[PDB]
Design a protein around this motif. Structure first.
Motif, PDB file in Angstrom:
ATOM      1  N   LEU A  10       0.807  -1.177   0.000  1.00 37.02           N
ATOM      2  CA  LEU A  10       0.000   0.000   0.000  1.00 37.02           C
ATOM      3  C   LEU A  10       0.873   1.274   0.000  1.00 37.02           C
ATOM      4  CD1 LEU A  10      -2.769  -1.294   2.407  1.00 37.02           C
ATOM      5  CD2 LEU A  10      -2.953  -1.029  -0.087  1.00 37.02           C
ATOM      6  N   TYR A  30      -4.424   5.611   0.545  1.00 42.44           N
ATOM      7  CA  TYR A  30      -3.451   4.531   0.739  1.00 42.44           C
ATOM      8  C   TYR A  30      -2.746   4.598   2.089  1.00 42.44           C
ATOM      9  CZ  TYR A  30      -4.053   2.551  -4.021  1.00 42.44           C
ATOM     10  OH  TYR A  30      -4.531   1.981  -5.179  1.00 42.44           O
ATOM     11  N   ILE A  60      -8.956  -1.804  -2.577  1.00 48.10           N
ATOM     12  CA  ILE A  60      -7.817  -2.193  -1.743  1.00 48.10           C
ATOM     13  C   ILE A  60      -7.994  -3.632  -1.211  1.00 48.10           C
ATOM     14  CG2 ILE A  60      -6.541  -1.709   0.409  1.00 48.10           C
ATOM     15  CD1 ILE A  60      -6.706   1.145  -0.016  1.00 48.10           C
TER      16      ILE A  60
END
Ligand SMILES: [Mg+2]
Ligand SMILES: [Mg+2]
Ligand code: NA
Ligand code: NA
Length: 326
Positions: A10, A30, A60
DNA sequence: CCGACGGCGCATCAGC
DNA sequence: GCTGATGCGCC
DNA sequence: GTCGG
């Protein structure tokens, strides 16, 4: 670091979005997801389990599933092979080169450490110094060295004027074993939210720390903020200590608590706390917490007597510096 | 859906 | 020079 | 990219 692979993934994606895409909210989403996953106290087994966390969404979660099944992310592999993205990501690593200057250097074939070194005259001062200490700035500072740096800064400040208080903030104040740099809050009775009864309060501290060879370079300097470089003294025949980024922030003495809250961080903790302030209808900066008015305008400063008061207003239980490492 | 996402210091630049 | 925008940095 | 309204 139960979910080290995930949060590395990430963070890398956040860095792409910041440096290459120049999409700051994507960088933020993020870093936020990364942060809530980092303190999640279980080894994640699935996207759909991560999605439960506030800040992890659909996209995500998919990336997390792809990462867990294959150990990799195809989206990152591509970004990693792209010359232009790798170039930009590398240049932005120099302090003072961001997304725009980075892209702009590539447009000219200035794209490697060696290109920058033959082209100093195309760098502003901050950038020249960031390139100078490029390697040093990559190195973490162990707390042991943070402790010597502290005695120096606290002792030299006391020498100019016995009424300056300097307080080391940042990850150091959060009890971190190592720190990326030194963050120093500075106060003097002469400088308050009402008046500045003395000019040069920050200058004098800087000069002093230069006079003892502690501060070696200046990236930027105004009336309230110094951004520069410093180095511990080494003993006979010892290799030198790395040079280290130092930041000194002079804050009105009566606004010490909002200032110390701010400078203790972390950056993400601040963003979340401030974000929450807004939902509670207040706004916080390094100076004050103010109510939001009906319209949307900041009312007057609310009275603050400790860091805790700030938390009280926004209906958060106290969190010690060491629990603010988000 | 879709608007809003933390806040501000300094260096630098354009426009007047 | 001044004022305000943009870039970059700090947490 | 995610979330609350
Ligand atoms: Mg730091
Ligand atoms: Mg710093
Ligand atoms: Na979620
Ligand atoms: Na940079």
């Amino acid at each position: 670091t139960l979910n080290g692979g995930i949060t590395d993934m990430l963070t890398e994606l956040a860095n792409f979005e910041k440096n290459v895409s120049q999409a700051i909210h994507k960088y933020n989403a993020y870093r936020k997801a990364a942060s809530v996953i980092a303190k999640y106290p279980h080894k994640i087994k699935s996207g759909a389990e991560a999605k439960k966390l506030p800040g992890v969404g659909t996209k995500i979660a998919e990336k997390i599933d792809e990462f867990l099944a294959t150990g990799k992310l195809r989206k990152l592999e591509k970004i990693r092979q792209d010359d232009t993205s790798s170039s930009i990501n590398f240049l932005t690593r120099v302090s003072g080169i961001g997304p725009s200057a980075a892209r702009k250097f590539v447009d000219e074939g200035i794209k490697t450490l060696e290109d920058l070194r033959k082209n100093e005259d195309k760098l502003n001062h901050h950038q020249r110094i960031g390139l100078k200490y490029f390697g040093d700035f990559e190195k973490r500072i162990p707390r042991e060295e943070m402790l010597q740096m502290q005695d120096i800064v606290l002792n030299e400040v006391k020498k100019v004027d016995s009424e300056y208080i300097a307080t080391v903030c940042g990850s150091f104040r959060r009890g971190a074993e190592s720190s990326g740099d030194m963050d120093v809050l500075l106060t003097h009775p002469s400088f308050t939210s009402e008046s500045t009864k003395q000019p040069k309060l920050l200058h004098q501290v800087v000069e002093q720390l230069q006079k003892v060879h502690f501060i070696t370079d200046t990236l930027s300097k105004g009336e309230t903020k110094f951004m520069g470089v410093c180095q511990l003294p080494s003993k006979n025949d010892e290799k030198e200590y790395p040079h280290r980024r130092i930041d000194i922030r002079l804050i009105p003495k009566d606004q010490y608590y909002c200032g110390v809250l701010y400078f203790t961080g972390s950056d993400i903790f601040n963003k979340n706390m401030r974000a929450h302030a807004l939902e509670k209808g207040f706004t916080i900066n390094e100076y004050t917490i103010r109510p939001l008015g009906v319209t949307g305008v900041a009312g007057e400063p609310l009275p603050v007597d400790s860091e805790k008061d700030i938390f009280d207003y926004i209906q958060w239980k106290y969190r010690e510096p060491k629990d603010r490492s988000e």
